[PDB]
Amino acid sequence: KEDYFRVDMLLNKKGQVILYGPPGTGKTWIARKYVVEETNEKTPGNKWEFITFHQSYSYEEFIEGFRPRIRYVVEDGIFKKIALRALVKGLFELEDATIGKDKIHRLYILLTKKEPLSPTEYEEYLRLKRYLWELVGGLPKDKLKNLTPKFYLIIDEINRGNISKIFGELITLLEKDKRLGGENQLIVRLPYSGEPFAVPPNLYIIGTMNTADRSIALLDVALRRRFAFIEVEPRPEFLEKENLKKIREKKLKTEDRKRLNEKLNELFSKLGNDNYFLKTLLEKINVRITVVKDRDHRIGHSYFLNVETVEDLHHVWYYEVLPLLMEYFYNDWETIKWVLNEKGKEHGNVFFEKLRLTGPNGEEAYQLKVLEGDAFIGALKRII
Amino acid sequence: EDYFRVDMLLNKKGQVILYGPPGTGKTWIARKYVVEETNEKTPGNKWEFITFHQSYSYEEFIEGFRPRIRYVVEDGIFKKIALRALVKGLFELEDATIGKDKIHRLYILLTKKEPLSPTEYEEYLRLKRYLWELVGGLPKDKLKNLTPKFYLIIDEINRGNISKIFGELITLLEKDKRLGGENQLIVRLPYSGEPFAVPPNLYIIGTMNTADRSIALLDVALRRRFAFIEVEPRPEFLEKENLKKIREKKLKTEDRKRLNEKLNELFSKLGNDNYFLKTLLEKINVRITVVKDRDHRIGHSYFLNVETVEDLHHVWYYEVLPLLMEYFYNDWETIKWVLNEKGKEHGNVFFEKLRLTGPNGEEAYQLKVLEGDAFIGALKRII
Amino acid sequence: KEDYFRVDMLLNKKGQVILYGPPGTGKTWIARKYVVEETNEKTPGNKWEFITFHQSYSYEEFIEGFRPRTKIRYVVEDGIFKKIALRALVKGLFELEDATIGKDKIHRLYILLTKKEPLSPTEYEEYLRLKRYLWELVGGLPKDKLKNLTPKFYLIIDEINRGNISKIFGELITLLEKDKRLGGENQLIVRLPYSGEPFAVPPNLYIIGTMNTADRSIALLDVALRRRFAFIEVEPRPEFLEKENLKKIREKKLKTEDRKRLNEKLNELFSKLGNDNYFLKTLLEKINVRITVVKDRDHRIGHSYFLNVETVEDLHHVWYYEVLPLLMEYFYNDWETIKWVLNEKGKEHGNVFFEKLRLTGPNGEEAYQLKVLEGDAFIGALKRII
Amino acid sequence: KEDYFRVDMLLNKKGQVILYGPPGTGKTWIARKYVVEETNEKTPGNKWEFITFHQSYSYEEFIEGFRPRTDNEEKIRYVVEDGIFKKIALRALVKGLFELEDATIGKDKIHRLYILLTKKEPLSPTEYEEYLRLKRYLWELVGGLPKDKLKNLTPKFYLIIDEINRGNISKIFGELITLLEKDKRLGGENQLIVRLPYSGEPFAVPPNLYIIGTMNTADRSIALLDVALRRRFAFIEVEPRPEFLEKENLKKIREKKLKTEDRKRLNEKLNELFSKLGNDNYFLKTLLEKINVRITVVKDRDHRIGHSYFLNVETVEDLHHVWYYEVLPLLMEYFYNDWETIKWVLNEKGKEHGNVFFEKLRLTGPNGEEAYQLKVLEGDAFIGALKRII
Ligand SMILES: Nc1nc2c(ncn2[C@@H]2O[C@H](COP(=O)(O)OP(=O)(O)OP(O)(O)=S)[C@@H](O)[C@H]2O)c(=O)[nH]1
């Protein structure tokens, strides 16, 4: 648990992390696994939330916005609700005579309530929010710093939405010192409600993002200072035989797992008795992609994580890896054949066989050749 | 062949995209696979057919605010078909915590073509939040195999902004992230504030044109969720036996024999060559592949309905010669070389060179209409 | 005719057609003529519609979109295509004899579709449940009954390339293919995003596009849309500019005694041209081959510029106010090309259309001016171009 | 006149013309003069309209669009209101159906529709539905009328579109690419009735209505209209006329307006002007000819200087103001940071630091960057610098 430990450390130092890398690495997996292993709660709900950003995601659905529920009810977004839940659950365990635990528990029932709030209860929600935000501030900073029952928000594909538009006052408030209990503790007031709001130290944010798409890759340095940035690189050592066996023996603790570790034995013996076939295959593929495009368009290891037989590797190759490589290099046949290091040969057991016709201006072109059986493993052996 | 690989890749990945040039039967094999898999010939209960375009948003697809005077969160097409797949999968799932009457009322509210009344919309929201309270406590090994199979064919999936339309479906569509999967995700939707997760009951078959690169699926993160099947042009369907085997698999009556001799009247005029259209499309696709992209190849649907020589003349002069002149605009040498008539500037040729020559040295050609045996003699030159 | 049979054959075979070519070749003319000759109606409405694509259409104004309908209601309203493709389907279900077809409801749906008044707020949900009953009926019908609906409906989409068709034709990338129409071997019934009600293009309907191919900025670069249409190149025919063909074209509509004047007006024309019936024909030929060699083949001058020419003053006005500005707009400030199109490149300072200016610039460049020639010097200048 | 006769015959033969040329040649004035000579109305209103296309002119404000309008003075709603062209086309068609002798026309309906097209106030919702129903009756009525009735309509309506290229003419027109042709109008041979997108009601251009556009061909950022859009309009070149700037010619043009005793004042003011220009009655004429020929060889033919800048010139200081505020910013706008060419148009190329319009600065940049400064000349030096342009 090393990536687990660095997510655990950089959440307790920066307050919030972003798991970046190429598509196919373990970002969403390590985020969801870390949060269900810290909260001890397998589903989203009270103690943690899972959201996904997109271009149809705005400030009004994230922090607060007007909604006709008629008059305008200032409906809180998901961040305001999880931050208020984190603050109220932290003021549960915070023993103090000024904290009225009867009103704080009523605010926790009003925040936990999955039903839409009645207009008889929305005024109670506003009054208890005013009492909560007039409670803190009068609370000392050394008590507001230590809040035990931590809350987590996983913003998957965080670079998909306009984060500077979605995060409103959260550009300022998400810094660890600008949270509650910190030394530069800052409680700003919100536009649509007028109520003061500040991020508690009880709530952490684990973003994940892919760095392949550069049109949505974040460049706001003032936004990037709020987050730690954990690079989840492609790990081809997960595709070694014993490591792939140990990974696939996670949810396999029955006799069917006995049908698993022999199914790899049919696989890796057919690959040439090499326990490092997929490992060095993805290694050579990623190191050849890194030098012709970038390191952020590397093939992640989750393409070959579900490979159990040779036909599974054939389907992952011809329907997930080769269309991805042909979308990487559109009509650039020399570069994609260099990625498979087939730049010299034009025929034979090859993935792109040369057409026997050259253009009127000297242009040439290739053809996707579907290899099967030992010829396919022989062509994959050439990449290593 | 293609049916078996669609059935195989739809189970291990959960969603497939049939891509390729126009003309190859991607929508055909998607519709045929889904009708042969659901045993119903109309979209509706167990499968839906949609087509993405630029007026698809996240609101019309998953959920969005719509006034009905009360602004309510109207579920889009995917949330209706995903809740329908989840509820219909929770029908046959025998358990003690699943109240079958609420699940059945939710299925009646989901499969209702009439718009829901305000007395039934709140019941719909209550049954939805009961459903999402239910599957948040259900084990993984019971949700892993829901009994029916629901399909959503998204034809021309690349014509809309897919990463904008698939709002929370970038995360949830992965087979290891569906309900009952090894890493089960349940996102929180922004508009309703209600949780949501794609069941393993529901499969997606996208189709995609790859000739147009302005709508190319360049999102590397979104290409990981789908398995990408290339439906290539198959010129071997235009062989004289395969043309009779394909065109008689749609009709069942006596007039199939009227199909037969009309084909034999065709290929006797082409030069007694049973592989005339096959080698014609193969040679033309090799020319297009070497002078333009391989995604601009001519599909076989142009020549599948060719049954006489006049239909081949109409398909040539009104479907693929405007297509070739649109491929190579004012590049007369390249379209001249695609029909391999680069030296032939006169005679029985498709583009006769004008005798007049411009002042800066440029020369132009003229589309010549060939009929009868001269047209077949010009088509024999391409082979 | 010939082009009439071309449009008829390709529209029956394909379902949709696009008459494309240079401006002024009779694409809108042969489209409107074919549609008023098939459906015997001189005015759109019942059996056919005429629309024009441009950048202010969208999917909402063509298929369906949300609109306010009077309190106020947020009502999804069908566009022109959904209205005509429900009208063609419902009119096709009149002559279908079947037990499951409830014609008392189909006739009410036809009355609500052909209702020129806007729908009442108590008559709109009647139309909605009638559409729901219709799409429950059509999905239950066998394919052989929907294969050949009895009438024929036409939608002339003129200047089709001027709008963003891939944005406008939302589901119609899929549905316009004749195998995906109703009763086809591979029929498809999409679900529309705004309403949620299903939709499918009947075989009753026939869309006819016309396209300007002189403009390259709006051309059909979309290859997948070009499968759905047949493509008729409507070339400029200068053989219509002969004296006998002008007498056949111009004296066809006005069948009164004025033909006995009009041919007289033609006899003053070509005798002023040199007693040559092929003056305008070879003039348009030897201009369009110049436009074909120095520009693309589809920036050519259409024959509709010279069809209304009756006297030499009309030819002078058509030359100096319609096609010489057009040639000056083709080759803007490119004098050695527009002068070469009129094949007066070596000529200057005479009976010429572009007189050379006596001044030369500091970089050695020169520019010419437009010279207006009248009388017989203009005809001697036009005789040079031939 | 002759230009008005040319506009009249090309407008009767094509239905719509465009007066195109450089700025300041009087294309708007020629269009307005011809229209007020036709309809005999000094102001727009019933029989003719005047609009200006700008960059933000849209189809929604030209044919029909969802415009906000208040219902019962309480709340705004977006309803489909007709633009300028649809209102003037319905007005022309209804006014032509006034004098049309036919029995199928319900005149007491049609006249009411004319009132609903001529009231200069927003329609109340009680009568806006009446206006919609009368439009539906009108398009049901002309859908059965023969061609011989609708061919000849008795009045003549005009729509002047000043600066027609400054908008997106295809996007603003829309259905008017097809409808504006003389054969595609009402009562024509190939009569066409489109179906508009927003209101969903039919529409067709009457032959009653004519369009006279003006086109500034100097700029070319937004000036490119399509070839099919060139086909609909006749195109009338309005050149700069420097022969309007001769002393007797400028006298007759300035005296064509109403002047009781100020004609002799204009006479003694114009004799004061040309006596300082070297006793040359043709000085402004050949000045504009030399500067326009020198514009034509280096710039486009459409970039010439219009003659109406010098039509108000009566004194020497008026000519100095016109030069230093109306034609030298025009030249500096055409030749932006092209100093040798704009110096060659005035043919003072190489002649620096004299009685010059563009004085060369005596500094030079790090890599040889050069700059010129607009020098203002007053008195005999300005007339001397004007003398060497010729
Ligand atoms: N056991 C194990 N499984 C992993 C690991 N990394 C990825 N996986 C598996 O691969 C699948 C895909 O990984 P995932 O984390 O979802 O990619 P991603 O980072 O979200 O990809 P993207 O969203 O940026 S496109 C997951 O379902 C997970 O089960 C790992 O380190 N260990």
Ligand SMILES: Nc1nc2c(ncn2[C@@H]2O[C@H](COP(=O)(O)OP(=O)(O)OP(O)(O)=S)[C@@H](O)[C@H]2O)c(=O)[nH]1
């Ligand atoms: N029998 C049979 N018919 C086919 C086959 N491939 C294509 N066709 C026919 O050709 C037509 C075109 O196939 P289609 O599915 O529409 O291509 P497409 O993928 O939609 O092409 P596009 O949308 O990218 S433009 C179909 O109507 C189908 O009937 C095939 O393999 N077998």
Ligand SMILES: Nc1nc2c(ncn2[C@@H]2O[C@H](COP(=O)(O)OP(=O)(O)OP(O)(O)=S)[C@@H](O)[C@H]2O)c(=O)[nH]1
């Ligand atoms: N008789 C006859 N008349 C024609 C023919 N072509 C054009 N015309 C006449 O010329 C006029 C212009 O034709 P039109 O239909 O507008 O050309 P177009 O192809 O639409 O030109 P555009 O819209 O791209 S600009 C028509 O009104 C018609 O009367 C023809 O082939 N035969």
Ligand SMILES: Nc1nc2c(ncn2[C@@H]2O[C@H](COP(=O)(O)OP(=O)(O)OP(O)(O)=S)[C@@H](O)[C@H]2O)c(=O)[nH]1
């Ligand atoms: N008497 C008389 N006045 C003229 C003549 N030409 C132009 N004018 C006057 O000069 C002024 C400018 O003319 P104008 O019509 O605006 O030219 P323009 O082509 O429209 O200029 P622009 O709009 O492109 S900048 C007008 O006020 C007009 O009255 C003319 O020939 N005779």
Ligand SMILES: [Mg+2]
């Ligand atoms: Mg992810």
Ligand SMILES: [Mg+2]
């Ligand atoms: Mg398709």
Ligand SMILES: [Mg+2]
């Ligand atoms: Mg037209």
Ligand SMILES: [Mg+2]
């Ligand atoms: Mg003006």
